[PDB]
Subunit: 671 residues, 3 copies
Amino acid sequence: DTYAGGQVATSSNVGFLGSKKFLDTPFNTISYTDKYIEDKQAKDITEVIAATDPSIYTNGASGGWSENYYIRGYASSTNDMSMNGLFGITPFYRTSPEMFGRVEVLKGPSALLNGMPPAGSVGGTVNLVTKYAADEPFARLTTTYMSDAQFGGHVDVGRRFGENKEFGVRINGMYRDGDAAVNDQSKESRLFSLGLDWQGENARVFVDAYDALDHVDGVTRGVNVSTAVGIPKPPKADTLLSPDWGSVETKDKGAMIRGEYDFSDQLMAYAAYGQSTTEYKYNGASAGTITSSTGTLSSTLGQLAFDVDKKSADAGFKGKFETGSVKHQWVANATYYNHTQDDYGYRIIPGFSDPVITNIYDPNPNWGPKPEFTPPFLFHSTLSTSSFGLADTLSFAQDKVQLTLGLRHQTVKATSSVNTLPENAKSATTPGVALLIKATDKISVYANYIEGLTKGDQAPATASNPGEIFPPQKTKQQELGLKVDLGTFAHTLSAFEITKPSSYLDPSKLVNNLPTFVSDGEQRNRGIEWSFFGSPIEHVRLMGGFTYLDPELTKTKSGGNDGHTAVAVPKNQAKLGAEWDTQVAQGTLTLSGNINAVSKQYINAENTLSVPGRTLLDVGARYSTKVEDHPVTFRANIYNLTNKAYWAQPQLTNLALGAPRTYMLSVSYDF
Amino acid sequence: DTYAGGQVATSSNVGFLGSKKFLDTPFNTISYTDKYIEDKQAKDITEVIAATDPSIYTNGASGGWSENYYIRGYASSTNDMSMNGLFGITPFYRTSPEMFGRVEVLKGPSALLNGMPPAGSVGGTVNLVTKYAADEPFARLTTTYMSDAQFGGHVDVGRRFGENKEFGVRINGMYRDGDAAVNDQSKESRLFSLGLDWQGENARVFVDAYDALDHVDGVTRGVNVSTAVGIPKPPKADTLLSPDWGSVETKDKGAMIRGEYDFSDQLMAYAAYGQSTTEYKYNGASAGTITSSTGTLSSTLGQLAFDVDKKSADAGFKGKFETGSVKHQWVANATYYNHTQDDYGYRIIPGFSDPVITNIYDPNPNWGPKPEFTPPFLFHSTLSTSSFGLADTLSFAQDKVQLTLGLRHQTVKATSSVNTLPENAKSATTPGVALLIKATDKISVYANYIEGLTKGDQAPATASNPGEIFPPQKTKQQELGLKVDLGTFAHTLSAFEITKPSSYLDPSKLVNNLPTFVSDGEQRNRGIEWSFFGSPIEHVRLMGGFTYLDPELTKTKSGGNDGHTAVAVPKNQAKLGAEWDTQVAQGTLTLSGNINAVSKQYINAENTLSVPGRTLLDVGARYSTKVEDHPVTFRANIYNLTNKAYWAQPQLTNLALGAPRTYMLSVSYDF
Amino acid sequence: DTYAGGQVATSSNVGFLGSKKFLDTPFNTISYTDKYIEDKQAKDITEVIAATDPSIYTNGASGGWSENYYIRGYASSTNDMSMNGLFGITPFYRTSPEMFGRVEVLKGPSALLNGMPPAGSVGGTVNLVTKYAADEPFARLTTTYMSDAQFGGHVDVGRRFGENKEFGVRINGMYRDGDAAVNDQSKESRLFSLGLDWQGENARVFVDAYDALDHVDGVTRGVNVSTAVGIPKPPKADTLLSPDWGSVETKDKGAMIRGEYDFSDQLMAYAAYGQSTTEYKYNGASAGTITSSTGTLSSTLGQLAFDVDKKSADAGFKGKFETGSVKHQWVANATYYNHTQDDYGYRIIPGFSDPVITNIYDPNPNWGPKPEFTPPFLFHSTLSTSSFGLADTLSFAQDKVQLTLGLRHQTVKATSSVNTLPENAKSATTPGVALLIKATDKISVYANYIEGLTKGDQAPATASNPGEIFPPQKTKQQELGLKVDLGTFAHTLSAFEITKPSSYLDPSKLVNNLPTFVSDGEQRNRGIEWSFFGSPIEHVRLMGGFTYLDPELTKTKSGGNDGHTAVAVPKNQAKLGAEWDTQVAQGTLTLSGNINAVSKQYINAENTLSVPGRTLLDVGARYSTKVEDHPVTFRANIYNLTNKAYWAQPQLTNLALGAPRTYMLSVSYDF
C-alpha cells in the first residue's frame, strides 16, 4: 500500500466512500506514512502535513496553545480531525503523531463525504489512521532529543494472538519533557495508546484508545499591533513575548470501536462509536499589545479552563452491483455527534487587572508574579449534530469513467446556559458530484462540486428577523484536476474556487425599519496547485509543489473591505523536500533538505498592515543499518537553519514569532 | 587552452600585444574559466577574481552600490574593465559574469598595452572574454538560490550555422530576485546577452551585445568614524547600517564589434568599435557617522542619478618579420573613448536635511519615511581620450629571449557645463619595456617597466597657479618574476615596486603669497607575491597564494603623513582554495574549502584608526552525474561559514560590515 | 597497551603501587592516549578528561586564568597534577597536552598512594605520562586553526640511538597564537619538550624537560551576583564580561629524572627528582558585580604576580615474596616537596581606584585605559611537605583475590614573611585498604577505603585558640565497584561516599568568652557512576556514562546551611562520545559526535541562587589517508555547535559564561 520511497501511501479514506487509490480519487489527497513521520521527527500533525504541501499554511510558532494551519487558504480546525474516519475522538488542540500509521489529507470542503465536523471548518479534512499489530511480533524503542534540552522516548510494541493470528494488540507509549528552543519555554508531551483488532471470517472489530497530555510552560499567545504604531522588526527568533510563568495544559482521552460485517462480496455493514474528553487550562497573557514603535508591550492577563465530553457515531451500508455495462458502488450512512462543555475564566483577574509593561527587545523582562489559577465557572454549553447521507459512483469500462452523485441531510443544535434567545435545531441538504476519467493507466482527469457546512449564527432580539437561527451555511467548491502516476513519481495539478459565507447585523438593510441580520458576507478563494511525490530518479525522493492563491474578501459589512485580501495566508507558496541515498558500508546514508518559501501576508482586513514573505531552510541526515540483524536508525534534523526571525499571524492575536532554529536527534532500535 | 583542473586557462590577452601563453608573458596574469565561475556560483566579478588571489583585496560588503577591489594595493575601478580588450563597454559598477567564457586579470599598470581607461585606475586590468558558440549545439539551464530568499535562473544556448559552421550564435539569459543574506536587503539582477561570430578564410567578425540590470533594496553605503569617538565593535554580520528603504539601480546596455583581416601570414589589420549606456539612480544615505562609543549613528540622506553615453574604438595593424636571427612581432594602434553624461542630485534633500539618528546595535532602527526620488539636473559633463601606440617584441635564440619595447601617446580632455575654469586637452607619452627568458621549456624569468596614467587634476582659483591643468600623471612599476609550470601545477613568484603620484594645494610652497597646486604627492607600493594553481596530485585542485605588501605614503601634504601606511589595504594576505574529488555511485562528488586570512588595515592616513585582520572560511560540495545521459550538476556553497562580523573600508566612507554567512545552491541540466 | 579503538589504554599508574591493569585496579581509573588527544584537538587537560567522563565537571569557560574541573564533585587543582608519578613539575594553571603519551585519571582521594599534593585537593589525581622515542624514527608536523583566527603548528620528532637502540630522544615543539572564539579574546601557547631515556640490562633512566607559555588577552575573570539583584539571562555565548585589555600570562619550566635499578626479580630501587618554576602575571578585573537586573556591571581592577620555585622527589623500593600460596608485592617510599614563592599585587591600582561601570548586554562596553603593570612586592612564602609510605598487595587463590593494605605518614609546614602567628610543622598518618575479586577473567568486583589530606588551617588572632595550626585534614572515601571487560568494550559501575572536613570560627563555642576555631565542618559527596569505553561493534567507538551525585553540606557554621547542596557542581551528568568509521577512496572517514547534559547548579551555599542545566553538542569529522605513502590526517571539530549561552561557576567569582561555538581544524603529515 506504499508508494516508491515509503513516505506516501497509494490510497486514502475519501470520507464515507472509504478507501480509494490516488488515480481513482476525484479530490486532491495525500497520505503520509509513519515512516515519513519518524523521518521528520514530527512532534505534531502540522509538522507532518505542512512541511511539503504548498496548499497548507502554518504561522509556524513554537509552543502555542494549539496547532494552527490553513488548507486551501481556509482555517482547518484541530477540533475537526477524524480518527479512522470518526470525528470527535482526536485531541482537541494538538496531537503528537506516535499512534498513527497514516496521516491523510483531503483538500477542500467535504460535507457530502464527512458531514459537518464539530468546529465547522471547511479548508480540508485530516484523517488519522491508527496502528494495529502486524503479523510478526514487533518492538521498537526510540529515544529523542530536541534543543535546547528536551529529552524523550517512545516504545512501540505489537503482537498477534490465536491460531490464525485473528487477534492483534499494538501499544505505543511516549514521554518527552524539557527546555525547548525558545527562551524560558518547556514542552511536555505524554501518550499511551492501544490498538486492538479481531479479524473474523465475515466480520471485523477495531478498538482504539489513548490518553494524552500536552503541557507548555512559557506558552506563546502572540501580540496585537495597530496602524497608529505599526509593526516593529521581529526580535530574535528565540524570544518569548508572553509571560515566562504562563502555561497551558491539555489532557485528552479517547476511545472508539468500529465493527464491519460482510453480508457478501457486494454488501457490507459498519458501525462506529467513540467518545473523548478534553480538559484545557490556560494561565497567562490574554494579549500583549505593542504600544510603541520602540517595542513597548502592554500585556493583560487572563485565565481560561474548559472541560468537554464528546460522543460520536457513524453507521451504514456499502454495496456494489452491475446493471448492464454500468457498475454501481454505493454507500448510505447516519452520523451523530454530541458534546457537553463547561467553561471557566477570568477576563480580568482580581488583583491583577493592571497590564504588565515590558519591551519586546528586553533580554531580561519582568513579567511580575504568577496569579494563582482559580478561574470561576462561566457557562455550560452543548452541541448536537446528526446527518444521513447517500452516494453512488456509476462506472463503466473497468472503472475508467466514474461519476459520483450524492446528498447528505445535516442537522445541528447548540445550547448555552447563558443564552436567553430561542434554541432550535436547524437543517440543510448538501449535494456533491464528481467525475473522473482515466485517459491512460497513468493519467486521470477529474472535476468535483462539493460543499462545506458551518453552524448558522443567531440574529439578536433587536433584528427585523429577531432570534432567527440560520441553517447550516454552505461553503461551495468547484475543482478541476489532473493526476499523473509515472510509476515511482506522481503529480497532481488542480484548480479550485471556494466561496465561504459569513453573517452579520447590517444596519444598511431595513425590514420593518429594523436592522436585518444577513448571511451576505463572502470570502472567495481561488487557487491553482501543482504538487508531486515519490522517487523521480533512483536513490532520490522529492515531495513538494507550488500554489498560487487569491483569497478575496468579496463581500464585507458596509462594503469597506470589499475586494481586499484575506488576512494571515500568503498568496504564493513553494515547498520542496528532497532526500538522496548513498550505500555506505553495511547501511544507507540519507541526506535531506527542505525549502519553504512564501509571499507576504496581511495582518488586518483593511490590508493596511502586512508582514513580508520568508523562506525557511531545513537539513537532515539519516543512517539506517542493522546491528546483529536488528534494525537501527539514527536521525539528525535542523529546522529553520538560518534562524530567520519572522512575524506571522496566529489564532486570536495579530502576530507571533516563528519557531527558531531547532535541532532534533533520534535513535531507534528494533528488538 | 585550459589548464589541469579546468578552472584556469593557459593564455590571456596582454592588451594590444594580444593573446600570450603563461610562460611567454612578462607580467603576472591569471585567467579564470566559466567552469570556475559556475563552481563558485559567482554573482559578480569580485567573487571570481578575489577568492584565491592574494594580490587582490576587497572590503567584502554585501549589496554595495558598486563592486570594490584593489590590485597590488591600488584601486582598480569597475569603470576600467575591458570586454574582449575594449574599454567603455562593461557595466559601470557591477557585472554579473554569466556572459563570459574567461575572466582575465593582469596585475599592475598597463598604459603601454591598454592606454588610459575611463577612471584612470592603475592597480590592474580585468578583461572579460565573452562566450561564442562551440561546434556542438549546446543548451544548459541552471536554477539558483542564495540565502535568505533569492531565487533565479540562467539559460545558456549556442549553435553554429552554415555548411562549415562559419557562423555562431550564443545567447545567455539570467534573472534573480529576492531577499539577500543581510537584514532588509534584497538583490535583483537581470542579463540578456548575445555573442555572434563569423569565421572567414582570411577575415573574422565578432559581435557582442547585452542588456543588464542591477538593483539593491537596502543598499550598503558605509559609515564614518572620528578619532575623538573611535571605532566601536562591529554589530552582527547581517546588520544593515544604511536605510532599510534605501535603494540603488543601474541599467547597463552595451554592444561591440571586432573585425580582423589577414593580408598575409605576416600582416593583419583589426578594428573594434563599441558603445554603452549607463543609467544610475541612488536614493539613501550619503553617509552614516558614528557619533558616540555607545553606537549612535547619524545618517545624512542624499540622492544621485546620472546617465552616461559612451563610445569606444581600437584599430591597428599587427605583423611579423625576421631580421637576421631576430624575429619581430609588432603592433601599431589608435584608440578613442568619448562619453557624455548628465548628473542629477540632492546633497541636501528638501524636507530630509536632518540626519536620521539610530544606533548601530539596534534591532529595530527607525529610518523614517522614504523621500520621493526627484533629484534636479546639476550639470552636463564629457570625457574624451585618445591614444596612439607602437610596440615590438624581439625574439632571439629560438624564442628563448623575448624583449618587448613600446610607447604610447595619450590625450585626455574633460569638460563640465558648470566649470568656470579653462578646459584644455592634455597629453603624455608612456613607455614600456619587458624582458622574458625561458630558462627551460617549463621555467620563465621576467622583468618589466611599465606605467599607468591618470587624468591630471586642475588647480583651484585659490592657488598661485590658478586653473592650471596637469598632464596625465604617471604611475610607475618595476617588476621581477619567475614562473614554473610543473605540468599540472604552476607557480608564480613576483616582486614589484609601484609609485603613484597625487596632487594637492600646498601651503608650504608660496608664490605671490599664495599656496601652489603641486603634483608632488606619492604613494609607493612594494610587494612580493607567491601564487599557484592546478592539480598538485590526482583528484585534488589547489589555487591560492601569499602576499606581503608595503603600501607607503612617501610624500604627503606638509609632510604630515610621510612614512605612514596607506588606508584600506592589508599588508599580509594568505588565500587557499582546495577541491577534492571522489567517485560516489554514478558521479563525482567534489568537496571544497577556502580560507582567506588578512592582517590589519588603517582607516585614516594619520594611521590613528585601524581595524584588525580577519580570517574567513568557505565550504562547498558539488555532485556531477547524468540523468538519462543528460549532464546534471548540483552545487552547494557556504561563504563566511563562521559568520564573522568585521569592519573594512569601502569607497567614499570609512567603514562597512563584511558580508555575513551566505548559502548558495544551484542545479544545472544540459539538454 | 592500547584498548580497542586506540583512544584508551589498558593500564594506568596507581600512585606508588605503579602500573596496574584495568581489571586488577580497585579504583575507578581511565587512561587516554595521545591519539585521543589529537582526535579531540585538545588545547588543555580539561578538553581531554572532561569530554566523556560524567564524574568530571568543568564550568567550561573560554580563556580563563586557569583550567577548572571537579572530580567526584570536589575540586581537583591544576597545581596537583603529576608528571610520570611526580608532583610539582607540571604547569601551574593550564597544560597544553602535546608532550604526553597518556593522560591518566584516578577518581577520588589517594593519600596512601600519592601523598598530599601541593594544593591539597582531594577530588582525584591526573597523571600525565610523557612521550619517549619509539623504535622506528618518527617525524610529524601538524598545523592548527581555531576560530576566529588562531593559527599554530606542532612538530613531534623521535629517534633511538646505539647498537641496541638503548637511547631515545623525543622532541615536541608547539606554537599557536591569534584571536579565539570569544569577542576580543586572543590565546597564545608555546611548548618545547624533551623526553630522553636509557634502557640498560638491569637499570633504566628517564629524563623530561619542558618550557611552556600560556597567554590570554581578554582573559575571563567572571562576575558576582547577589540575592537582592538576582541572576539575569546570559548574554550571547561569545560575550566577554571582563576588560578587553585584561591579560594573563603564565610561564612554566620543568625538568625531572627517574632512575630504576633491578637488584633481582624480587627487589628493585627507584628514585625521581624534579624541579619547576612558574611566573604568573595578571592585569585586569578582580571582580565584576552585576548590580541591576538591567545588566549593570561594576568592575574593580587589580594586578597580581607571583613567582614560585619548586623541587620534588620520590624514592623507594619495590619487591615480591610468597607466603605459602599467597603472593606479596610491596612498595616503600619517601617523598619531598618544597617551594619558595614571591607575591606582588595591587588590590587598588593607583589612578584606577574607581570601578568601571558597564552593562553585560552592551555590545561596545567602555573598559577605559589599560593600567601599566607595576604590582609592588607583598610577601615571601614557602611550603614544605614530606612523607613515608608502605603498602603490600596480597594475592590469594591464583591471583583472583587481591588485598592491598598500607599507610603513609605525612608532614607539612608553610611560612609567610607577613605572618605574625606561629609557624610549625604538623603531621598525620593515613591508612588505605582495597580489595579486588576477579569473579571471572572478564569481571572484577572491588572496594576501597582511602583518605585525602589537606594542610590544616590556622586559627586567627580573634579566636579563643589563636594561632592554633590544625594537622593535615582527612578527607575519607569508601567505594564499591564492578568492572566488566567484554573484550573490545568495557564498563565500570561504582558507588562512593566521600567526606571532606572544613574549618571555621564557631560563635556558639565560647572559651574564655571568645569564639573557637574548629575543624567541625563537613561536606559529604555520595555518588553512583556508570561509564564505558571501547568499540561495542566494528567501526564504532563509544565513550561516556551517567552519574548521580549528592554533594551535601552536612555541617556548616552555626548550622545555617546544614543539609544544603554544595555550590557549582550538577547532581546529574550524562555524556556520550561516539565515532563511526567508513572507507572512502584510499582512506578512512570518521564522523564523530558528543553530547554533554547536566542538571542545575547552585551558585551559593544558602541555595537561594542557581543556574539551570544545559546540554551541549559537538561534532567532528576526520579523514586519514596517505599521500605518496606518507600518512596524512585531516580533522575538523565544532564544539558547542548550538552556541548555547549559559552561566556556570568558575573559581573565585560566582559566574562565568561557557565557551561559545568553536571551530577547530588540523592537518598532520608524517615525514
